[PDB]
Amino acid sequence: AATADVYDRLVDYAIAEWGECPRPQMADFVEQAWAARGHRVRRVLELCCGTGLMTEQLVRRGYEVTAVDRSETMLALAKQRVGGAADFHQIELPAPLPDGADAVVCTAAAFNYQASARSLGETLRAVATVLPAGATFVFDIETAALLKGHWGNRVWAADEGDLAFIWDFTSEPDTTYCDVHYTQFTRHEAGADAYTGVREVHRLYAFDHDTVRAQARAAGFAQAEVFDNYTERPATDTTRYETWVLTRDE
Amino acid sequence: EPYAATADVYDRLVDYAIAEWGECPRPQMADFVEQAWAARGHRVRRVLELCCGTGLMTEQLVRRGYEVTAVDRSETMLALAKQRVGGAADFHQIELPAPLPDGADAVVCTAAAFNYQASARSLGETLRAVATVLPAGATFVFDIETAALLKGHWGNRVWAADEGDLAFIWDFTSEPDTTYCDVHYTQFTRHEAGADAYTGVREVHRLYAFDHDTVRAQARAAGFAQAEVFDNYTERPATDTTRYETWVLTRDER
Ligand SMILES: Nc1ncnc2c1ncn2[C@@H]1O[C@H](CSCC[C@H](N)C(=O)O)[C@@H](O)[C@H]1O
Numbered sequence A: 001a002a003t004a005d006v007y008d009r010l011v012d013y014a015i016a017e018w019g020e021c022p023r024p025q026m027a028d029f030v031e032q033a034w035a036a037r038g039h040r041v042r043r044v045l046e047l048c049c050g051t052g053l054m055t056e057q058l059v060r061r062g063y064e065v066t067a068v069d070r071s072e073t074m075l076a077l078a079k080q081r082v083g084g085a086a087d088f089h090q091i092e093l094p095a096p097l098p099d100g101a102d103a104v105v106c107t108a109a110a111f112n113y114q115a116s117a118r119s120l121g122e123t124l125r126a127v128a129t130v131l132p133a134g135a136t137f138v139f140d141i142e143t144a145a146l147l148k149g150h151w152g153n154r155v156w157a158a159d160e161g162d163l164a165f166i167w168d169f170t171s172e173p174d175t176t177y178c179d180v181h182y183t184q185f186t187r188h189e190a191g192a193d194a195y196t197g198v199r200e201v202h203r204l205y206a207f208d209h210d211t212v213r214a215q216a217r218a219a220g221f222a223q224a225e226v227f228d229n230y231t232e233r234p235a236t237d238t239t240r241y242e243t244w245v246l247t248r249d250e
Numbered sequence B: 001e002p003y004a005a006t007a008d009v010y011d012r013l014v015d016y017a018i019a020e021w022g023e024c025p026r027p028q029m030a031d032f033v034e035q036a037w038a039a040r041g042h043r044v045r046r047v048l049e050l051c052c053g054t055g056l057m058t059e060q061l062v063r064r065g066y067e068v069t070a071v072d073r074s075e076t077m078l079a080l081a082k083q084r085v086g087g088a089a090d091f092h093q094i095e096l097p098a099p100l101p102d103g104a105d106a107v108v109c110t111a112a113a114f115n116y117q118a119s120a121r122s123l124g125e126t127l128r129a130v131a132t133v134l135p136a137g138a139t140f141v142f143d144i145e146t147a148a149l150l151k152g153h154w155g156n157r158v159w160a161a162d163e164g165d166l167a168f169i170w171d172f173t174s175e176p177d178t179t180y181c182d183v184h185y186t187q188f189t190r191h192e193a194g195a196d197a198y199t200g201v202r203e204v205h206r207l208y209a210f211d212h213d214t215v216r217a218q219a220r221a222a223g224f225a226q227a228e229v230f231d232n233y234t235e236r237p238a239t240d241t242t243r244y245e246t247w248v249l250t251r252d253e254r
C-alpha cells in the first residue's frame, strides 16, 4: 500500500465526481440519528475503518472508538491519523467481533464487497451478537443506480502529477454487480520520471431493499430504516448511496 | 531498435482512436484516395504526403506501388516512418507552411494533421504551398476533425486505458467561446515485464476547429476553387454530425 495522502485523494475524487458523502457530514448524520432516537452512545465500534477518516471524526467528537479492518496496513495508517487514540483490531467480516459498544457503524460502502446475501446476513449476525437490545447499527451501500446506471462500463481517470489513477468499470446488463479495475501510478521522486504501478480488481454487488430487510430481520434487526446518503431524505430510484439505520431486536 | 517499440506505442494509440473515437483505418483512407484518383482519370505515380508521422499512411502508399515523398517537421517521426517502409520513400523535414518538393501528381494529408494549424491564415498558407507544387486539375486530399468532435464529443471528457505494459490518459478541455480544444496526454510504459517500474511522460497541445466556410474560403484563395467534403473517407457527404471530414480539393486551371 501507500500513504494516507493517496487514499485521501481517492476519497476526494469520489466526493467530487460521484457524490460520495464527506466524512464530517457522515458523522453528523449518525450523531443526529442517535440523538433523535434517544440512544446513549459513548463507545463506538467501526467496521472496515480503512485509513481511519471516519475514525478521526468519531474520535474528535469524543467517543471511545474501537475500529477493525482486515488489512494491517490500513490499521497502521488509521492509528497514525488519530495518533493511536483508539483500539484497533485486525478482523475480516464475517467473523467474531469485539463487544462492549453502544453503537456500530460501517461507512464507505464496504458492504458492496459482500459476495452474496448470505455473506451479508452473516455480517449482520456478527454485529447483532455484539449489540445490546434496542441499539443501532448504521452502514451505507451503493445502489444499482450507481453501480450499473452511473458507473456502468465507463472510465474515470485523473493525472495529479505525483499520482495518477484509472477507474475502469464493467457492467453486464443481466447481473446485479459490476467489476472495477483500478490502476495507480505513484511518483518516486519529484525530479524524476519513475513511477510505481499498482492494480486492484473488485466486484461490487447491489442488494435491493427486499433482500436487505430479509437479511436484517433474520439477523435480529426486524426494524430497518433507509435514507439517501446521510440525509433525512428517503431513498428513491435515483439514490446512489443508501444509509441504513438498523435497530436490534428486544 | 528503440523504435519498433516506440512506433508500437504510437500504433496502439491509433488502435485506440480507431476503436473508441471512430478514426478511420489507414487502408480505407488509401482506398478512398485511390478511388478519387481513378474517378478523375488521374494516372497518379508520384504522391506527396504531408505530416506523415510514424508513416502508417506512407506504408499504404508504398505498398500500393506509388513513388512517395513524405514530409514532417520531426526527424524522430521521419526516422520511424523511414524504418516502417524500409526506406522506400523520400523523406523531407519541413515545418509547414513552407516550400514543398515539386513534381507530385497528388497530395494527401491524413489523420487530422491540419487541426494543429493554430490559425486560418496559417491553414491557408499551407494550402497555398500545396497549390504551388500541383498542376491544374490535380487533387489534394486531407482530413480534419470537426467542432462536433473537438467541442462536442471529446470537448471536456477524459479517456484512459490500462493495457499492462502501456497505460495512458487523454484529458480534453473545451470552452464554448473558443475554437480549440486543450489536450493533456499522460503515458506510462513498463520497463520490463515482471516489475512494476514505469516511466511517466506527459504532453500538452491544442486542436483547432475550422467551419466549412473558412476552409472553402481559404482553399479558394489558395487556388482550390472546387472542394468536395465527405464523412470520414466514405461516399456520404459531411453533415452537422460528422466528426472527421475528408476534403477533396482540385487545383484550379491556369
Ligand atoms: N469483509 C471485510 N472485513 C474487513 N475489512 C474489510 C472487508 N472488506 C473490505 N474491508 C476493508 O475496508 C476498507 C474499505 S472502506 C475504508 C474507508 C472508510 N470506511 C471511510 O469511511 O473512509 C479497506 O481497508 C478494506 O480492506
Ligand SMILES: Nc1ncnc2c1ncn2[C@@H]1O[C@H](CSCC[C@H](N)C(=O)O)[C@@H](O)[C@H]1O
Pocket (backbone or CB within 6 Å): B026, B050, B051, B052, B053, B054, B055, B056, B057, B071, B072, B073, B074, B077, B094, B095, B096, B097, B109, B110, B111, B112, B113, B116
Ligand atoms: N506544421 C507542421 N509541419 C509538419 N509536420 C507537422 C506539422 N504539424 C504537425 N506535424 C506532424 O504531424 C504528425 C501528427 S498527424 C500524423 C498522422 C499520420 N499522417 C497518420 O496517417 O497516422 C506529427 O508527426 C507532427 O510532427
